[PDB]
């Protein structure tokens, strides 16, 4: 509830910075994931660096209830109870021969039930592979090469990574016997021919206006388990750019969508998509106030090391999502549109993305 909203709202704001910077390119992101690893980060920071993170996220991780809330949240989401195909990894790596604050590790581990890993970034390629293998093996082998070539070097002292793979199955899946190349109309007027799925069913649907007055469709594709949903949304009119919608998104608005949904017999035309995005969190986080964490001597990580100056050399998220098959009105998404994977009991925005070109 409370912390699920803070986390989601925060993550949706990060998504927006990412979106406003790749205005015409495919993006998949995880609001929840970036909130999770920046909450971890809070434990390692101090002074103004810590205050920046806290002012942007809306809560302090060491307040009572805060951390236990987040763990209960994690167990609510990643519950093999749901037979869920979410695989997730968070991880902070720090240079090996720096004296860590006594008492930090046991504390970090009690709160998050994971640990900060120590490696030697002086073996540049060996350390890149240790981190990559760690991410790969902890995402069911789905997320490879998170750290690209030259992403780390001898001076690298602290690296933050977040990786997610999601392959849910729609409660009511699209029948393959109904997929066909259709004209998809891109943000720059030019069109292209992509395969679009289609299905006539009793879909949850509603429509909203932007603060500007532009109309848009929202539709909810529930997943097996009755717990997660994908929402698909796009301005009805093609001359209105998807950004008019992305710019007004929030975790609350998304809750209102769900709240207004009604079950209506509809024809849905929806392009298949396979997205894999690596997002460099630096610029987006910087745009939200968190600037110090990236500056060599101004960054305060004195909760992690009281003696040696640390700064974040890389903060990276890599996400992968595959959306495939497993007198009604028509909703045709032959334009750029948004998607959101939502955990409805808590209101957590797990995934969010835009398809500008499938
Ligand atoms: Cl557009």
From Swiss-Prot:
A GO CC term assigned to this protein in UniProt: collagen-containing extracellular matrix
Gene3D superfamilies named among the record's database cross-references: Alpha-1-antitrypsin, domain 1 (2.30.39.10), Antithrombin, subunit I, domain 2 (3.30.497.10)
Molecular functions (GO terms): protease binding; serine-type endopeptidase inhibitor activity; signaling receptor binding
The entry's keywords: Glycoprotein, Protease inhibitor, Secreted, Serine protease inhibitor, Signal
One Pfam family it belongs to: Serpin
Residues bearing attached sugar chains per UniProt: 204, 260, 324
Subcellular location: Secreted
BP GO annotations: angiogenesis; cellular response to lipopolysaccharide; defense response to Gram-negative bacterium; dentinogenesis; fibrinolysis; negative regulation of blood coagulation; negative regulation of cell adhesion mediated by integrin; negative regulation of cell migration
Tissue expression remark: Expressed in endothelial cells. Found in plasma, platelets, and hepatoma and fibrosarcoma cells.
Induction (record text): Up-regulated by coagulation factor Xa (F10) in atrial tissues. Up-regulated in atrial tissues by rapid pacing resembling atrial fibrillation.
PTM comment, free text: Inactivated by proteolytic attack of the urokinase-type (u-PA) and the tissue-type (TPA), cleaving the 369-Arg-|-Met-370 bond.
Disulfide bridge map: none
Ribosomal protein recorded as keyword: no
Connected disease: Plasminogen activator inhibitor-1 deficiency: A hematologic disorder characterized by increased bleeding after trauma, injury, or surgery. Affected females have menorrhagia. The bleeding defect is due to increased fibrinolysis of fibrin blood clots due to deficiency of plasminogen activator inhibitor-1, which inhibits tissue and urinary activators of plasminogen.
Protein purpose: Serine protease inhibitor. Inhibits TMPRSS7. Is a primary inhibitor of tissue-type plasminogen activator (PLAT) and urokinase-type plasminogen activator (PLAU). As PLAT inhibitor, it is required for fibrinolysis down-regulation and is responsible for the controlled degradation of blood clots. As PLAU inhibitor, it is involved in the regulation of cell adhesion and spreading. Acts as a regulator of cell migration, independently of its role as protease inhibitor. It is required for stimulation of keratinocyte migration during cutaneous injury repair.
Similarity comment text for this entry: Belongs to the serpin family.
Quaternary context: Forms a heterodimer with TMPRSS7. Interacts with VTN. Binds LRP1B; binding is followed by internalization and degradation. Interacts with PPP1CB. In complex with PLAU/uPA, interacts with PLAUR/uPAR. Interacts with SORL1 and LRP1, either alone or in complex with PLAU; these interactions are abolished in the presence of LRPAP1/RAP. The ternary complex composed of PLAUR-PLAU-PAI1 also interacts with SORL1. Interacts with PLAT/tPA. Also interacts with SORL1, when complexed to PLAT/tPA.
Protein name per its UniProtKB record: Plasminogen activator inhibitor 1
Native source species: Homo sapiens (Human)
């Amino acid at each position: 509830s409370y912390v699920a909203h803070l986390a989601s709202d925060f993550g949706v704001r990060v998504f927006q910075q990412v979106a406003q910077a790749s205005k015409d390119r495919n993006v998949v992101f995880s609001p929840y994931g970036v909130a999770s690893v920046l909450a971890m980060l809070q434990l390692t920071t101090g002074g103004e660096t810590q205050q920046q993170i806290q002012a942007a996220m809306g809560f302090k991780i060491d307040d009572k209830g805060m951390a236990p809330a987040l763990r209960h949240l994690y167990k609510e989401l990643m519950g093999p109870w749901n037979k869920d195909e979410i695989s997730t990894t968070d991880a902070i790596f720090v240079q090996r021969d720096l004296k860590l604050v006594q008492g930090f590790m046991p504390h970090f581990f009690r709160l998050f039930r994971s640990t900060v890993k120590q490696v030697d970034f002086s073996e540049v390629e060996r350390a890149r592979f240790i981190i990559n293998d760690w991410v790969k093996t902890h995402t069911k082998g789905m997320i490879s090469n998170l750290l690209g070539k030259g992403a780390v070097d001898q001076l690298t002292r602290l690296v933050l990574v977040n990786a997610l793979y999601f392959n849910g199955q729609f409660k009511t899946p699209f029948p393959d016997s109904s997929t066909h190349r259709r004209l998809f109309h891109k943000s720059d007027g030019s069109t292209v021919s992509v395969p679009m799925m289609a299905q006539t069913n009793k879909f949850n649907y509603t429509e909203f206006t932007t603060p500007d007055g532009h109309y848009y469709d929202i539709l909810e594709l529930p997943y097996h388990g009755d717990t997660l949903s994908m929402f698909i949304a796009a301005p009805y009119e093609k001359e209105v750019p998807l950004s008019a919608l992305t710019n007004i998104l929030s975790a609350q608005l998304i809750s209102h969508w769900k709240g207004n949904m009604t079950r209506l017999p509809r024809l849905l035309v929806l392009p298949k998509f396979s997205l894999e995005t690596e997002v460099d969190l630096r610029k987006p986080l910087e745009n939200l106030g968190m600037t110090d964490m990236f500056r060599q001597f101004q960054a305060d990580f004195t909760s992690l090391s009281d003696q040696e100056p640390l700064h974040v050399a890389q903060a990276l998220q890599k996400v992968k999502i595959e959306v495939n098959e497993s007198a009604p009105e028509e909703i045709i998404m032959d334009r750029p549109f948004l998607f959101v994977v939502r955990h409805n009991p808590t209101g957590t925005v797990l995934f969010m993305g835009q398809v500008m070109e499938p």
